[PDB]
Amino acid sequence: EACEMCRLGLPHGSFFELLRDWKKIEEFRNKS
Amino acid sequence: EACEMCRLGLPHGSFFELLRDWKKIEEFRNKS
Amino acid sequence: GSNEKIRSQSVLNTLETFFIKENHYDMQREESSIVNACLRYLGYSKSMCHEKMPIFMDIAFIEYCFNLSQQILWEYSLISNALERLENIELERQNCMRELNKETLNNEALKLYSCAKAGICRWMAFHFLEQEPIDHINFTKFLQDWGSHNEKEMEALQRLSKHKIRKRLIYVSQHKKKMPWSKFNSVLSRYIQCTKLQLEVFCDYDFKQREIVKMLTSNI
Amino acid sequence: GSNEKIRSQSVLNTLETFFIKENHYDMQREESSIVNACLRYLGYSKSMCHEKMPIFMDIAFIEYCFNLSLDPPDSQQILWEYSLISNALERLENIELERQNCMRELLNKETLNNEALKLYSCAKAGICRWMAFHFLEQEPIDHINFTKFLQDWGSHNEKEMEALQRLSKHKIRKRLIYVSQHKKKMPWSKFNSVLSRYIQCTKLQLEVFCDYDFKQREIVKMLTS
Ligand SMILES: [Zn+2]
Numbered sequence: 393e394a395c396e397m398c399r400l401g402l403p404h405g406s407f408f409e410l411l412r413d414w415k416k417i418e419e420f421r422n423k424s
Numbered sequence: 425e426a427c428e429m430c431r432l433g434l435p436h437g438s439f440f441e442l443l444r445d446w447k448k449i450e451e452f453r454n455k456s
Numbered sequence: 457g458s459n460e461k462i463r464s465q466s467v468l469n470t471l472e473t474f475f476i477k478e479n480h481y482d483m484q485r486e487e488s489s490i491v492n493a494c495l496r497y498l499g500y501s502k503s504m505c506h507e508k509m510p511i512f513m514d515i516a517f518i519e520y521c522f523n524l525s526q527q528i529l530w531e532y533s534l535i536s537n538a539l540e541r542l543e544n545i546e547l548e549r550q551n552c553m554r555e556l557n558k559e560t561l562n563n564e565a566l567k568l569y570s571c572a573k574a575g576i577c578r579w580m581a582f583h584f585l586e587q588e589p590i591d592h593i594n595f596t597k598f599l600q601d602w603g604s605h606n607e608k609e610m611e612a613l614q615r616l617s618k619h620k621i622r623k624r625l626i627y628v629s630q631h632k633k634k635m636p637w638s639k640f641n642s643v644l645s646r647y648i649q650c651t652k653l654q655l656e657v658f659c660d661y662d663f664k665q666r667e668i669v670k671m672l673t674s675n676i
Numbered sequence: 677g678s679n680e681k682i683r684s685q686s687v688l689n690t691l692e693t694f695f696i697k698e699n700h701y702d703m704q705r706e707e708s709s710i711v712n713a714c715l716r717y718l719g720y721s722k723s724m725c726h727e728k729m730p731i732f733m734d735i736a737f738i739e740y741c742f743n744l745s746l747d748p749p750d751s752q753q754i755l756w757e758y759s760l761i762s763n764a765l766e767r768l769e770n771i772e773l774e775r776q777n778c779m780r781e782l783l784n785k786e787t788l789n790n791e792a793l794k795l796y797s798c799a800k801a802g803i804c805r806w807m808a809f810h811f812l813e814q815e816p817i818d819h820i821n822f823t824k825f826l827q828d829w830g831s832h833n834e835k836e837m838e839a840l841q842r843l844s845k846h847k848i849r850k851r852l853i854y855v856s857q858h859k860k861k862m863p864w865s866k867f868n869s870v871l872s873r874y875i876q877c878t879k880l881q882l883e884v885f886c887d888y889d890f891k892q893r894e895i896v897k898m899l900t901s
């Protein structure tokens with residue numbers, strides 16, 4: 393119960409940021 | 425070499441047929 | 457070559473953790489995308505084409521196909537394949553059991569099996585009979601393949617097929633309401649849970665039935 | 677709670693089997709969908725929100741993000757964007773920290789360690805530089821994020837980073853001339869080689885000494901005889 397993001401069920405942490413970054417690169421290479 | 429589907433590189437076998445059947449059920453339940 | 461084997465094996469092991477439930481598997485919306493991606497990967501995996509499909513796949517399919525948790529697709533090719541996978545489950549049950557409560561459960565599976573198989577074959581037949589025009593070739597081809605233990609019931613459906621739509625609907629509608637689908641949903645659900653229970657207890661599978669075994673030991 | 681823990685650990689094991697390469701990871705068409713689905717599953721998994729990410733994920737990310745190659749060239753595959761590249765440097769730092777930590781706890785050990793350190797500093801600086809080049813060619817310059825980037829990732833190189841901040845005040849032609857000339861002198865292919873070697877050197881160290889498997893058996897076999 394320390395983590396308010398976990399309490400609200402919202403996505404966060406390393407695996408989430410990896411996902412977003414991974415998606416950014418895919419986006420960039422399909423357009424390009 | 426013996427299996428001509430393997431030689432042709434086309435999909436076949438239990439896992440493929442399971443896939444097709446699973447997709448049919450999904451397509452049916454998606455507009456229901 | 458065989459790195460593709462290792463990838464495919466690993467994808468299959470992930471499906472095992474998603475599919476093997478205590479109760480029945482269903483597609484929760486948070487898991488559709490990965491389960492689909494796993495199934496498509498195994499489906500197109502060159503290394504998996506002639507590989508023995510684990511029995512948890514057939515069980516998850518039956519649980520999914522008949523919504524065991526108008527949702528069932530009553531289509532000839534699909535239900536035929538569904539019955540074939542239900543058969544695969546039963547053969548695997550028999551072999552694994554062949555190696556007091558052992559025989560009670562074994563007999564319970566045998567009765568639920570035939571009863572479930574009958575229910576599926578019957579309701580497929582009802583669906584053939586509701587169409588207009590009927591496909592007499594496939595209707596017949598289906599009854600020959602699957603309803604060969606309930607032959608007098610299939611004989612009756614065969615000669616019902618000669619009547620036109622109005623009378624077919626009246627027989628089907630009255631016989632649907634005499635024994636509704638909920639009966640067979642309950643029989644089929646019980647055959648799956650009884651098979652899972654047998655295989656974990658005696659044949660050393662793992663269907664997350666540890667808690668179910670402790671409740672039967674308690675005496676309720 | 678514990679069941680979705682198990683499911684997320686299994687998705688992670690499947691990713692391990694797709695990401696760990698003898699050479700460098702790249703996204704193949706036939707794996708796109710399952711790799712994307714596994715990454716999204718882990719990204720929303722409640723049980724993974726405060727799990728330490730295994731080092732193979734960072735490595736795969738770095739290989740993918742910088743489009744690393746050993747043997748072979750592709751036209752502009754690297755997304756030079758502040759937030760992405762800052763997160764990439766963080767993940768490279770994590771690889772380095774893992775490598776340093778595991779190397780603390782046969783006769784080639786000191787050499788492999790020292791070679792990784794040199795390669796890390798050079799890789800880090802090269803990524804910094806090329807990100808800075810990108811900033812310098814934007815018009816107008818994003819001075820807040822540009823200054824922020826250099827503070828965070830140009831503390832060791834404080835001598836070079838004074839010049840870029842002065843250069844950012846000059847007009848676009850001057851900045852373009854500078855970048856043009858500095859790219860010809862030290863092109864990206866040099867840093868592709870540095871990163872590739874950092875990553876491959878690290879994988880070997882971690883395999884031989886620190887009990888990882890990064891599919892370097894053939895490099896270890898050659899290092900015997
Ligand atoms: Zn949290």
Ligand SMILES: [Zn+2]
Nearest residue numbers: 427429430505
């Ligand atoms: Zn084949």
